[PDB]
Amino acid sequence: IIKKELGLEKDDKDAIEEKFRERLKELVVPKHVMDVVDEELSKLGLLDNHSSEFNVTRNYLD
């Protein structure tokens, strides 16, 4: 019941997450780099779009 509260297509966020994920699907990704990407994406999800930390994170992730 908690989760089902204002779905709105889950607010249509974190599309850059899946964009980069698809970007990595074709590549054979070493384990260390992949875990780093997972951590960085986890940080991305928690960060607001405006913060310069978020911008640097996204630039590095790309």
Next chain:
Amino acid sequence: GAESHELQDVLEETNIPKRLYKALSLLKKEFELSKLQQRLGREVEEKIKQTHRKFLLQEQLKIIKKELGLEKDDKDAIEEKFRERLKELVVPKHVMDVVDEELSKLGLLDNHSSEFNVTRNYLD
């Protein structure tokens, strides 16, 4: 609700059908006016109700959090990351308190400044 000018124009119409059709025109004008008035008032009231429901559901979203999303602050996340990273380490107490001081400054500095970036790099 026709003004004095429209009523004078109608009174200047001697032909009964013509004045009747002009009165129909005035009636239709007032019809559209009142219809738009009521539609706009209803639009306003539904939008205010939607605002109140948006507040309700923003509280319900805060419930959704359960320590998710905004509750991390994007900096205490760095706190937790560093602490877990050095947890497995048998870390010296001196550098432990230095890391504590660095984290305290991290909390004492904004997320959108150069000195904060330098602090983050040094703690990295």
Next chain:
Amino acid sequence: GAESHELQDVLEETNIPKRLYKALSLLKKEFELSKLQQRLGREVEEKIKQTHRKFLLQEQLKIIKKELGLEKDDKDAIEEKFRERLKELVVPKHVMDVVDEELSKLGLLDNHSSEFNVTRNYLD
């Protein structure tokens, strides 16, 4: 809204009274579930309405006295306070128009605003 396994059980029930009673029990269970879902938001609404009721009581005790229970906040009096604090000075004109603009902003700006606080300090 009974689960698939509940329908499986009802189908495996081969006695008419058994299946009917089991269906009724499922009905009451799922009604309880859905009504709880509604009740959570309804109670959020109740909380907001109670809080705004208490805020309205506070508003009643604030406006009824009309400052006959408290005293004038003097925030508007800041205008005249500063002006008399300046009235006696033979002064150029550009500074007067700047002062008037700052005073107008003060009138517009809310009391609690940080913009308002900086405006107050600058005018001091």
Next chain:
Amino acid sequence: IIKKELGLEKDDKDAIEEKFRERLKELVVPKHVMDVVDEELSKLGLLDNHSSEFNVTRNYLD
């Protein structure tokens, strides 16, 4: 009527205004901080108990 209505909703925050005020009573204290604390407490009452900025203001008062 004024007095009783004030008493009904006396406190701006639960046992905050009274405690801080009496705490100040035993302090021979300059006029400036009296006016400042009066302004802060007025805006405190204008604010809600749980507002985060209200909590920061209360921290400042403490």
Next chain:
Amino acid sequence: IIKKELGLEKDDKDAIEEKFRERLKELVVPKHVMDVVDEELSKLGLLDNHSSEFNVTRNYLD
């Protein structure tokens, strides 16, 4: 229908815009700064005096 009851029209008057306009009316202005000030006045109108950006914009206008 726009002009029915606007108590807010009195405050944040458009008078400053006309003041600047007349101020520059007696001068042979470049079209460049003319369009620039049109854009700036439009932005200021969509902005509120309470905004600090409003004040910075007004200083640039000056």
Next chain:
Amino acid sequence: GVGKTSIARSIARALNREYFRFSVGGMTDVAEIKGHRRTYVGAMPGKIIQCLKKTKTENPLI
């Protein structure tokens, strides 16, 4: 003027791999190889990473 660069291009095309040149003459900054720290906003990675990005393969002709 012996075609060293030209023969480099010829090898790149004949092997079917990609090509990318680089000037280091009179250069004194290590950053271009090791990039920047990723911390200074506007920091850039090493030129080699950029070449990998452009060729999009790890068997280029650098």
Next chain:
Amino acid sequence: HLPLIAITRNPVFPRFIKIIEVKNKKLVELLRRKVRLAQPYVGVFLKRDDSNESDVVESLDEIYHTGTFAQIHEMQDLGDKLRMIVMGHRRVHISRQLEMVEVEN
């Protein structure tokens, strides 16, 4: 004796119209094959816990023996290629779905 219909979280209550839609195109061949029949019909069944399409294509034990035989109503194909229409006309409970022999119990 047609392959079991993939319910895919589309319960079909007896005597209650329902619409089943499946992403995989395999059911397209099955639907097109039965059109030639003068009286097209389709069985309806219920899945068990631990839903899995892979198990459906591997084993038939996943689908409950209980089901609801009925008639295919009409083809729509508005935006998708599969808008199966299932109704509850005749309840059935297969004695042994391994082996199609079915008794309208």
